[PDB]
Amino acid sequence: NQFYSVEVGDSTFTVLKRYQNLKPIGSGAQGIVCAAYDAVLDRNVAIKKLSRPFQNQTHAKRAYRELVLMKCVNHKNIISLLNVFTPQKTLEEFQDVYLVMELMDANLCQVIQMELDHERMSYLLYQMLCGIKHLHSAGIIHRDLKPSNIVVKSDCTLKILDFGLARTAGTSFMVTRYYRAPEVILGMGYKENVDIWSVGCIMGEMVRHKILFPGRDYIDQWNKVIEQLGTPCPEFMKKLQPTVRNYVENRPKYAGLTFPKLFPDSLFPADSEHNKLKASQARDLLSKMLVIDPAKRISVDDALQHPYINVWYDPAEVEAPPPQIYDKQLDEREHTIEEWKELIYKEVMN
Ligand SMILES: Nc1ncnc2c1ncn2[C@@H]1O[C@H](COP(=O)(O)OP(=O)(O)CP(=O)(O)O)[C@@H](O)[C@H]1O
Ligand SMILES: CCCCCCCCCCCC[N+](C)(C)CCCS(=O)(=O)O
Ligand SMILES: [Mg+2]
Numbered sequence: 001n002q003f004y005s006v007e008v009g010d011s012t013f014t015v016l017k018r019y020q021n022l023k024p025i026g027s028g029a030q031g032i033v034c035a036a037y038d039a040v041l042d043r044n045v046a047i048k049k050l051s052r053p054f055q056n057q058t059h060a061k062r063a064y065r066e067l068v069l070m071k072c073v074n075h076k077n078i079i080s081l082l083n084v085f086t087p088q089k090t091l092e093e094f095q096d097v098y099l100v101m102e103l104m105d106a107n108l109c110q111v112i113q114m115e116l117d118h119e120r121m122s123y124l125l126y127q128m129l130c131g132i133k134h135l136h137s138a139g140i141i142h143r144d145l146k147p148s149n150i151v152v153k154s155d156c157t158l159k160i161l162d163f164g165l166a167r168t169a170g171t172s173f174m175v176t177r178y179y180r181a182p183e184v185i186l187g188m189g190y191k192e193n194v195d196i197w198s199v200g201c202i203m204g205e206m207v208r209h210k211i212l213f214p215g216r217d218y219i220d221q222w223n224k225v226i227e228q229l230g231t232p233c234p235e236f237m238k239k240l241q242p243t244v245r246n247y248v249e250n251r252p253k254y255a256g257l258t259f260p261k262l263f264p265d266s267l268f269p270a271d272s273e274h275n276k277l278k279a280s281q282a283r284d285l286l287s288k289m290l291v292i293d294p295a296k297r298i299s300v301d302d303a304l305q306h307p308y309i310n311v312w313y314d315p316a317e318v319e320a321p322p323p324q325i326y327d328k329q330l331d332e333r334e335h336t337i338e339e340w341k342e343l344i345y346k347e348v349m350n
């Protein structure tokens with residue numbers, strides 16, 4: 001037999017014998033993740049067992065989509081699929097899906113806690129922007145980028161772990177909401193630079209070591225946004241839905257803190273002239289990403305040209321050919337659970 005079972009992180013992993021010494025490294029709603037040694041390849045890998053992929057159509061749709069995209073995409077800043085397998089032998093018995101990835105060392109939540117110097121921080125941001133540019137070029141707009149779904153090696157190489165939801169989900173997420181853009185929270189729609197707000201929130205957190213816009217719910221989060229950035233313009237509040245517009249127009253008015261007051265010199269390395277230069281450049285980029293109105297917010301392409309980021313720019317990394325996805329209806333079509341199950345099986349069996 002080609003499989004063995006091991007209990008890891010309170011779940012049963014039934015895996016190919018090539019995968020040895022499984023140890024837990026993380027989990028979330030979509031699966032449980034282990035590090036393992038691959039004996040066929042001679043390297044460590046990460047194995048994710050999908051959690052209840054056929055619990056309902058959302059689970060199945062998201063599993064199928066993550067499988068097709070992870071296979072289709074080939075970019076240094078997006079996690080690659082090394083292998084995928086199921087221990088079950090038929091469509092009728094099919095229950096579990098295991099994804100095998102390159103093994104990274106940490107998620108961004110851990111890295112964010114470090115006193116990051118400007119070389120590391122700019123490099124991490126540069127790589128996130130490269131990954132986002134690549135996803136955008138294929139029509140993948142993430143909308144829920146956050147530190148837990150970005151991973152890093154100890155050499156600061158960075159990969160994004162997932163693709164956010166289908167276009168058809170719009171700005172809806174039916175735990176961690178702090179990185180979602182105003183246009184998402186308020187239901188205004190979105191364009192590509194929706195992901196720039198999330199990069200701004202992560203960058204702001206790397207500086208402050210505090211979540212920028214925390215809170216128990218969207219209501220509390222919106223207060224944190226307007227208290228820090230200021231009440232939005234007439235150009236913007238205009239567009240909100242009846243109950244929302246009214247709530248938003250009726251909140252207390254705030255000038256905003258200036259970016260110097262939001263991210264003071266006190267948070268930045270102070271040694272040298274190089275350090276003073278880099279504090280104002282970091283601030284200036286933050287001031288262009290953390291902009292409530294997406295019409296006034298910097299683009300991914302322009303953020304790559306920013307002096308804080310552009311030092312790293314290499315067109316071989318930035319300007320790679322976009323993924324061509326076969327399924328032009330991928331985000332749209334709905335299926336029964338049974339139908340999704342078969343689509344996923346075929347995908348697993350290649
Ligand atoms: N290839 C990998 N290398 C190292 N760690 C990984 C990894 N894949 C996942 N992880 C770790 O496992 C944790 C959760 O994994 P994963 O992101 O796939 O769960 P999830 O999709 O169920 C919810 P979320 O994406 O929001 O974290 C990560 O935050 C990270 O710490
Ligand atoms: C402070 C919290 C406020 C929560 C308010 C919820 C907002 C209500 C949703 C309005 C939907 C408007 N359309 C025009 C349908 C948006 C397009 C679809 S999508 O934006 O891409 O999802
Ligand atoms: Mg995920």
Ligand code: NA
Pocket residue numbers: 073074075076077078079080081
């Ligand atoms: Na990839």
Ligand code: NA
Pocket residue numbers: 226230231232248249251252253254
């Ligand atoms: Na206000």
